[PDB]
C-alpha cells in the first residue's frame, strides 16, 4: 500500500526524468557539522520569513502619499491628517486580525536578518573562508549585506510616520542633495522634485517589495549554489585534509538538522513578534516637517552611518561660490567602507602574497594580524553604533551629551588602536597556551606533595611518554587542544536511570559498555582513515 | 561496475556502500543508537521526543483557538476591555512561536537520539578540471569563434560593435531619461519672477508688499489650523513655531483652503522658531551683518530647519539660549544670530525679519536673505 505507492511513483518519476544519479549525488553530499557553519542559514531562514510575512503585508498596504483624514478605530489619532501609507499601516495593526503580529514578526525578522549577516560575515573573515577559490562568493555576500541594509531602511520608511520620515529627510534627502555637482540632480531624480513630494513612498514600495528583494534572491541563489558546488571549507582535525570533506551526508542527518533549525529560528522570531513591541507607529504620529522627537535613531544596521554623521566635525569648504557641506564626508566614508569590505580578499592576497587554494580553515588565534584587524574593525563599528545612541545613553546613563560626542570623536581614533594591540597579543597568547599543552600535557588540577616536600601538578599526556615518564612533545596541527580533564572523559557518567530512579544494573552495564565500544570504534575509524591518507 | 544480476543479489547495505563509492563518499563510521534492545532508557527517550512533539501540537491547537476566540479588537484607553486586548498579539506570538519551537526541539532530539551517528568522507575533486575537459571545451569555443569567420570580417565586426553600442546608448538614455529633472528650472511664482524651488519657501513674497503673517498651529485639523499671533502672546523665555500664512489661504473650511493649508504645513522650508529674549539678556545679543534690524525688539525669528541636514532643530533651552537639533546634536547660539557652537553644523540658522502691522499682529518684514535648509553644491 504505502510502500507499493512509493515504488510506483518512484518508477514513474524515473522513467520520465531519469533523475536517479543526480538525486543520489545530492543525497550523498557531505557537510561539516561545525556549529559556526549554521550561521549562514539563520540569515537564509530570516529571509524566507521576511518573504512570507511581506507577501502577507502587501495584501493590505497602500503606499500613497495622498493626504487623508484618519477615520479608523485608534482614538488618539481621530481626525488627524495623514498619508494613505500611514493610514494603512495603522489599519494593518488595528483593523486586520493578526496584522500587528505579522508586522512585528516582519520587523524582528529584518533585525535578525541583518544581525545574522553580520555574525556570519565575522565567521567568514576570521576563519579565512574568503580565500581562493572563494573570493567571488565573499564579494556576493558583501553585496548581499549592502542590499539588506538598504532594503531594511526602505522597508521601515514605508509607513511614513514621524520617526522614519525624519530619517528620510536627513539621510536620503539631505546627504543626497549635498553631493557635489550631481547632488541636487540625484535628489530630483529620486524624489521627482524637492522633498517630500508625492512619488517617494510608492517608488520606495516598488523597490522594497519587488526590485531589491528580487536582486537579493538572485544573489542568494548564486551564493548557495557556489557553496554547494565548491564544497564547504572545514577546520583542521583528525582525518581532515585539503582534498576531502568530513561530516555527514544530506540524507538524512543534515536535512533533519537543517529543517529543525529552521523550525527553531521560526519559533524564536514568532515569540519575539508576540512578546516584544517593535516600531509602534501609532505612538509616533504621521510625518510632518514641522515636528520632531528626541531620539532619532535608525534601525541598528544603519546606526553606524548615523553615528559617523554625529561624530565627524563641521568641516566644510566653500570654493569659488560653491559649497561642499559636512555630509559629503559621510557619503565618501560609506563608499570607502564598502569598497574596503568588498575588496578585502584581494587586499590580503596582495599583502601576504598567499595565492594558494585553501579548503582548510584557520583558527582565528593562528592568524594574529587578521584577527587584530577584524577586532579593530568591530571596535570601530561598535563605537559608531553607540555614538548613534549617544543621546539615549546620555539620558539613561547620566553622561553629558557634549561629552559623549567627544568620547566618540577621540575613541574613533584611539579605541581601534588599543583593540588592535590587545587582540594581536591575545591571539599570540592563545597560541602559547596551546603550545603549553603540547609540551606538557593537560593540567589535571591535582596537586601532589612528594616525600621531600615538592609540590607537583599531575599532567595527562596527549601522546607517548618517556622512560622518565614525561610526554614526548607533540606538534601543533592547527586544531584545538583539550584543556579540561572532564572534556576527555575523566568524570565518567552518573548511572543509568530516570532523574529520580535508577534502571536495573544490568541495563546500565550493557548501555555503558555499548557506549564505550561505539566511541572507541568511531575514534579508530577516524584514526585509520587518517593513517591511510 | 556490477551487473544487473549482481545488483539483484546485493543487500541494502552493500548497495548503499556502492552508491556512496560512485559519488566519492565513504561512510567510515555508522552505528545504531540502541545496540542493546529492550532498555528502559530507550523507552524513556522515545517518550521525551514524543513529549516535545505533543507540546508542539497542543500549542498549535492553542494558536488556532486563541486566533478564533480571543478578543482581538482595539479597546480605547481606560475601557473595560483594554487589558484583554493588550494580550491578543502576545498570545498569538506565544502560541505560534512555542508550537513550531517545540516541533523543532523534538526533531533535533530525534536526530540526536535515534538516527544513527555517522562519519562520512567525500573527496573534493576540486581545482582545475581534468585536461581532457579543459582541452575539449576550449576547442569547442575556439572552433565556434574561428569557424564563424567573424574575426576576419572587419566591416561586419565594426558594424556590429557600433550598432550594438548605438542601440544600447539610445535605449539606456530613453530608459532613464524620464527620471532626469533639472532642479534649477524656474517653477515658483515670486515677486520678481519664477524661481527654482530651492531658492524659495512659503516666506517668499508672491507680489511686492504681500502681507505674510506669522501663524501658529492650533492643533485642530481643519477649522482654522493656523491663526494670527500677537507679540504679547509669547512670554520672555517662550518659543513658538510659526508658519507663513496669508489672508487668502483661509480657515480651511473649503476644499481649496484646506489644500492651501496642507501645502503650508508640509512645506519643508516653512517652519520658523519665534523666541522672546529676556530683556535682561538683550545686551548680550550679537547681530549678524545685514540682519541688524530683523528682530522686533526682544522677538527673534529663525528658521526651524537645521542647516546641517534639515531636521527640525527645535530643542530651545531658554536659559542657555541654545537651540539643539535632536538628529545629530548641533547647537546654535540664539544670542549670536543662531551661529553653530557644537556639532556637525558649520552654518548659522537663517533669520526671518519680522515686524507688526497696523492691527498689532506679527508679520514678516520681507524674506530670508539667504537660502534656508541644508546646503548644496550650488549655494552661496
Amino acid at each position: 500500500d504505502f510502500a507499493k505507492l512509493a515504488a510506483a511513483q518512484g518508477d514513474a518519476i524515473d522513467s520520465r526524468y531519469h533523475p536517479s544519479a543526480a538525486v543520489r549525488r545530492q543525497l550523498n553530499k557531505v557537510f561539516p557539522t561545525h556549529w559556526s557553519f549554521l550561521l549562514g542559514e539563520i540569515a537564509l531562514y530570516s529571509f524566507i520569513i521576511l518573504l512570507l510575512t511581506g507577501v502577507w503585508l502587501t495584501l493590505f498596504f497602500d503606499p500613497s502619499m495622498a493626504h487623508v483624514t484618519y477615520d479608523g478605530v485608534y482614538q488618539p489619532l481621530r481626525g488627524v491628517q495623514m498619508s494613505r501609507a500611514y493610514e494603512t499601516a495603522l489599519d494593518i495593526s488595528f483593523e486586520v486580525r493578526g496584522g500587528l503580529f505579522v508586522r512585528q514578526v516582519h520587523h524582528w525578522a529584518a533585525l535578525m536578518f541583518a544581525a545574522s549577516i553580520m555574525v556570519h560575515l565575522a565567521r567568514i573573515f576570521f576563519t579565512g573562508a574568503f580565500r581562493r577559490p572563494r573570493e567571488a562568493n565573499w564579494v556576493i555576500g558583501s553585496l548581499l549585506l549592502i542590499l539588506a541594509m538598504f532594503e531594511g531602511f526602505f522597508g521601515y520608511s514605508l509607513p511614513d510616520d514621524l520617526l522614519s520620515g525624519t530619517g528620510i529627510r536627513a539621510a536620503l534627502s539631505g546627504i543626497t542633495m549635498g553631493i557635489p555637482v550631481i547632488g541636487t540632480w540625484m535628489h530630483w531624480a529620486l524624489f521627482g522634485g524637492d522633498f517630500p513630494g508625492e512619488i517617494l513612498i510608492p517608488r520606495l514600495y516598488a523597490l522594497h517589495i519587488l526590485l531589491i528583494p528580487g536582486i537579493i534572491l538572485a544573489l542568494i541563489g548564486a551564493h548557495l549554489a557556489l557553496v554547494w558546488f565548491q564544497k564547504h571549507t572545514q577546520f583542521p582535525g583528525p582525518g581532515r585534509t585539503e582534498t576531502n570533506v568530513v561530516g555527514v551526508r544530506v540524507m538524512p542527518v543534515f536535512a533533519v538538522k537543517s529543517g529543525a533549525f529552521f523550525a527553531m529560528i521560526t519559533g524564536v522570531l514568532g515569540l519575539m513578534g508576540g512578546l516584544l513591541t517593535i516600531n509602534p507607529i501609532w505612538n509616533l504620529g504621521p510625518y510632518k516637517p514641522s515636528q520632531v522627537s528626541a531620539g532619532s535613531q535608525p534601525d541598528f544596521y544603519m546606526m553606524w552611518t548615523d553615528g559617523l554623521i554625529r561624530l565627524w566635525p563641521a568641516w566644510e569648504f566653500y570654493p569659488f561660490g560653491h559649497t561642499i557641506p559636512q555630509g559629503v564626508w559621510v557619503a565618501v566614508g560609506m563608499g570607502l567602507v564598502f569598497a574596503l569590505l568588498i575588496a578585502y580578499p584581494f587586499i590580503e592576497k596582495k599583502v601576504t602574497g598567499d595565492d594558494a587554494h585553501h579548503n582548510l580553515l584557520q583558527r582565528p588565534r593562528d592568524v594574529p594580524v587578521r584577527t587584530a584587524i577584524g577586532s579593530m574593525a568591530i571596535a570601530l563599528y561598535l563605537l559608531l553604533t553607540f555614538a548613534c545612541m549617544n543621546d539615549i545613553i546620555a539620558l539613561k546613563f547620566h553622561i553629558s551629551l557634549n561629552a559623549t560626542t567627544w568620547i566618540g570623536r577621540i575613541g574613533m581614533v584611539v579605541l581601534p588602536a588599543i583593540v588592535y594591540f590587545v587582540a594581536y597579543r591575545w591571539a599570540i597568547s592563545l597560541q602559547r597556551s596551546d603550545r603549553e599543552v603540547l609540551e606538557h600535557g593537560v593540567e589535571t588540577g591535582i596537586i601532589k606533595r612528594l616525600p621531600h616536600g615538592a609540590y607537583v601538578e599531575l599532567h595527562q599526556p596527549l601522546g607517548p611518554v618517556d622512560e622518565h615518564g614525561h610526554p614526548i612533545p607533540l606538534e601543533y596541527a592547527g586544531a584545538p587542544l583539550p584543556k579540561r580533564m572532564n572534556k576527555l572523559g575523566s568524570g565518567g557518567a552518573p548511572g543509568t536511570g530516570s532523574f529520580l530512579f535508577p534502571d536495573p544494573a544490568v541495563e546500565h552495564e550493557a548501555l555503558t559498555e555499548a557506549a564505550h565500544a561505539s566511541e572507541h570504534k568511531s575514534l579508530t575509524a577516524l584514526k585509520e582513515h587518517q593513517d591511510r591518507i | 561496475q556490477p551487473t544487473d544480476a549482481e545488483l539483484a543479489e546485493m543487500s541494502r547495505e552493500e548497495l548503499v556502500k556502492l552508491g556512496g563509492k560512485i559519488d566519492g563518499v565513504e561512510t567510515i563510521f555508522k552505528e545504531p543508537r540502541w545496540p542493546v534492545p529492550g532498555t528502559k532508557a530507550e523507552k524513556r527517550t522515545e517518550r521525551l521526543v514524543a513529549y516535545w512533539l505533543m507540546l508542539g501540537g497542543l500549542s498549535g491547537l492553542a494558536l488556532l483557538l486563541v486566533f478564533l476566540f480571543w478578543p482581538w479588537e482595539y479597546q480605547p484607553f481606560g475601557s473595560e476591555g483594554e487589558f484583554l486586548y493588550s494580550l491578543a498579539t502576545p498570545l498569538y506570538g506565544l502560541t505560534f512561536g512555542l508550537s513550531i519551537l517545540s516541533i523543532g526541539i523534538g526533531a533535533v532530539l530525534f536526530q540526536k537520539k535515534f538516527i544513527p551517528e555517522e562519519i562520512s568522507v567525500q573527496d573534493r575533486h576540486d581545482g582545475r578540471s581534468p585536461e581532457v575537459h579543459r582541452k575539449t571545451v576550449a576547442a569547442n569555443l575556439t572552433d565556434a569563434l574561428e569557424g564563424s569567420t567573424l574575426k576576419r570580417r572587419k566591416v561586419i565586426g565594426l558594424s556590429l560593435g557600433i550598432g550594438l553600442g548605438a542601440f544600447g546608448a539610445g535605449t539606456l538614455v530613453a530608459f532613464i531619461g524620464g527620471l532626469i529633472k533639472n532642479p534649477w528650472k524656474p517653477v515658483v511664482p515670486t515677486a520678481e519672477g519664477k524661481k527654482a524651488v530651492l531658492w524659495t519657501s512659503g516666506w517668499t513674497p508672491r507680489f511686492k508688499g504681500e502681507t505674510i503673517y506669522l501663524a501658529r498651529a492650533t492643533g485642530r485639523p481643519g477649522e482654522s489650523p493656523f491663526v494670527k499671533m500677537r507679540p504679547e502672546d509669547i512670554d520672555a523665555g517662550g518659543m513658538e513655531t510659526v508658519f507663513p500664512w496669508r489672508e487668502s489661504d483661509g480657515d480651511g473650511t473649503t476644499v481649496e483652503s484646506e489644500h492651501k493649508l496642507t501645502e503650508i504645513a508640509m512645506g519643508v522650508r516653512n517652519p520658523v522658531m519665534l523666541i522672546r529674549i529676556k530683556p535682561a539678556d538683550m545686551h548680550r545679543v550679537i547681530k549678524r551683518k545685514g540682519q541688524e534690524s530683523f528682530n522686533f525688539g526682544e522677538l527673534f525669528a529663525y528658521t526651524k530647519v537645521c542647516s546641517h541636514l534639515g531636521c527640525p532643530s527645535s530643542l530651545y533651552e531658554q536659559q542657555t539660549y541654545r537651540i539643539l537639533c535632536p538628529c545629530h546634536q548641533s547647537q546654535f547660539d540664539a544670542l549670536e544670530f543662531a551661529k553653530p557652537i557644537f556639532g556637525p553644523a558649520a552654518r548659522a540658522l537663517a533669520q526671518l525679519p519680522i515686524t507688526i502691522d497696523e492691527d498689532g499682529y506679527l508679520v514678516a518684514n520681507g524674506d530670508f536673505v539667504e537660502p534656508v535648509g541644508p546646503a548644496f553644491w550650488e549655494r552661496k
Partner: peptide
C-alpha cells in the same frame, strides 16, 4: 573653512517700521 557670508556686525540696528502691505494678489 568658515562660510564667507556669515560675519558679526557691530551696527546696532533700528526698530522695524510698521507693516502696511500693498494690494493685488
Amino acid at each position: 573653512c568658515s562660510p564667507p557670508g556669515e560675519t558679526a556686525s557691530s551696527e546696532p540696528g533700528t526698530t522695524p517700521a510698521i507693516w502696511t502691505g500693498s494690494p493685488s494678489p
